[PDB]
Amino acid sequence: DLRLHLLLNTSVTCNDGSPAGYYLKESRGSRRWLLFLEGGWYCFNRENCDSRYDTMRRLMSSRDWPRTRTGTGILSSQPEENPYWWNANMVFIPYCSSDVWSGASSKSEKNEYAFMGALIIQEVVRELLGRGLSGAKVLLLAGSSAGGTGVLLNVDRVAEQLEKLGYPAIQVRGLADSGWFLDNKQYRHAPTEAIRRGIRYWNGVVPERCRRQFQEGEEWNCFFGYKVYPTLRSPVFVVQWLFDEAQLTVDNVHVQEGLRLYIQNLGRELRHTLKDVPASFAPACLSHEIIIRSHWTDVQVKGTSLPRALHCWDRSLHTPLKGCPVHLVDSCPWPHCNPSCPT
């Protein structure tokens, strides 16, 4: 079990002004720290956020959070479930800001909701430095779905924060799961518009180099992995199903020739965007997240599981390693052409 800590700085809040927080399980024998960002879509105006508050309130408030959570998948402390980092210090950061982890805006007399995702990550890191993180050798910022996009938006800011606080020895790395989306044309006629509205509603922030490329009004581009990734300095391992269900949902895909060609082209486009991503794991499966599922060990690309690829990535961050690959992208063109895809 990971134990809840609400932030001591209670001005860093969930959407409704309740304190944000994190769940922690320490491993005093370990200098590895895994901080995982939960996902769960986002909301982008008063009306859609009010709807989310009625029926997805745990994603907007800490008032009903449980005192503990069980770590699963990459957050598991059992080596059988987590061959990769079972002995690490484990941190689960609940997603309660509805802003893809990008916001820096308080609730106020002008704002019904607070969107503080980027500040929640910063404050979690700051408070963890007093609970052991100051001794870390590696901080892996991981996340799934909106949390995976959150890794992309925030990993270099975590690295800068630790440098400025006087901890240049902590190596900050990112693991972005299911957060690598394409701003493609829908199958029937969108992503970009809702992100553009969201960033304005949230006061959303993006990494500085990407901001400087795209400039004002165009920062929505930095929410798309293939555009933001090249601007990042921290090592980032990208996990993405080639036929991700959330990508298909935004594309209005729910099989005749036009749809067959659409799906094949989507997989080819995704594979193309990962060609120059050296640490990546991209199986040809129709599915959603990977990394906190208890059976995350089961899928393989070219005979290599994700926990193995991640271990190979760790070794590479000590020339390619014999039998220990880190770039694992399926080339077969249709969902479940890889026999290890989830059931």
Ligand X SMILES: *[C@@H]1O[C@H](CO)[C@@H](O)[C@H](O)[C@H]1NC(C)=O
Kindly tell me which of 41 and 214 has the beta carbon lying closer to ligand M9K: 41
The pair phi, psi for residue 84, each rounded to 5°, is: -80, -65
Residues forming contacts to ligand M9K in the complex (CB under 6 A) are 39-41, 100, 145-146, 149, 181, 191, 195, 223, 246, 250
140 forms part of the interface with ligand X (CB under 6 A): no
Edge-to-edge order in the sheet of strand 327-329: 68-69, 2-6, 21-25, 89-93, 32-37, 138-144, 171-177, 236-239, 280-282, 327-329
For residues 281 and 304, give the distance between their C-alpha atoms in angstroms, rounded to a whole number.
Answer: 9
Q: Give me the least distance between CB of 10 and ligand X, in Å please.
A: 8
9 forms part of the interface with ligand X (CB under 6 A): yes
- State how beta strands 286-287 and 280-282 pair: unpaired
Output the CA torsion 245→248→254→255 (10° steps): -110
- State how beta strands 171-177 and 2-6 pair: unpaired
126, 91 Cβ separation under 8 angstroms: no
Work out the burial of residue 342: count CB atoms within 10 Å of its CB; fewer than 13 is exposed, 13-18 middle, 19 or more buried: middle
Q: Which of 98, 102, 144, 145 is catalytic?
A: 145
Q: Which does 11 bind (CB under 5 to 8 A by kind): ligand M9K, ligand X, none?
A: ligand X
Residue nearest to ligand X (CB): 9
Q: Give me the least distance between CB of 329 and ligand X, in Å please.
A: 38
124 forms part of the interface with ligand X (CB under 6 A): no
Q: Which of 288, 305, 314, 330 is catalytic?
A: 288
Kindly tell me which of 123 and 219 has the beta carbon lying closer to ligand X: 123
Kindly tell me which of 123 and 314 has the beta carbon lying closer to ligand X: 123
Kindly tell me which of 130 and 339 has the beta carbon lying closer to ligand X: 130
Non-local (6+) Cβ contacts of 230 within 8 A are none
CA nearest neighbour of 156 among 128, 125, 194: 125
Q: At what angle do helices 146-165 and 117-129 cross, to 10 degrees?
A: 50
Query: Residue 298 carries which side chain, given as an amino acid letter?
Result: D
11 forms part of the interface with ligand X (CB under 6 A): yes
Q: Which does 119 bind (CB under 5 to 8 A by kind): ligand M9K, ligand X, none?
A: ligand X
244 is catalytic: yes
24 forms part of the interface with ligand X (CB under 6 A): no
Kindly tell me which of 21 and 204 has the beta carbon lying closer to ligand M9K: 204
100 forms part of the interface with ligand X (CB under 6 A): no
Tell me which of 12, 24, 118, 153 binds ligand X, using CB under 6 A: 12
Q: Which of 99, 156, 244, 330 is catalytic?
A: 244
| Number of other residues whose CB lies within 10 A of the CB of residue 238 | 27
Work out the burial of residue 117: count CB atoms within 10 Å of its CB; fewer than 13 is exposed, 13-18 middle, 19 or more buried: buried
Tell me which of 59, 119, 176, 312 binds ligand X, using CB under 6 A: 119
Kindly tell me which of 151 and 309 has the beta carbon lying closer to ligand M9K: 151
Structure tokens at 17: 């002004």
Of the candidate spans 5-13, 18-26, 65-73, 157-165, the one that interacts with ligand X by CB under 6 A turns out to be 5-13
Q: Which does 246 bind (CB under 5 to 8 A by kind): ligand M9K, ligand X, none?
A: ligand M9K
Q: Which does 41 bind (CB under 5 to 8 A by kind): ligand X, ligand M9K, none?
A: ligand M9K
318 is catalytic: no
Binding site for ligand X (CB under 6 A): 9, 11-12, 119, 123
Q: Which residues are catalytic?
A: 145, 244, 288
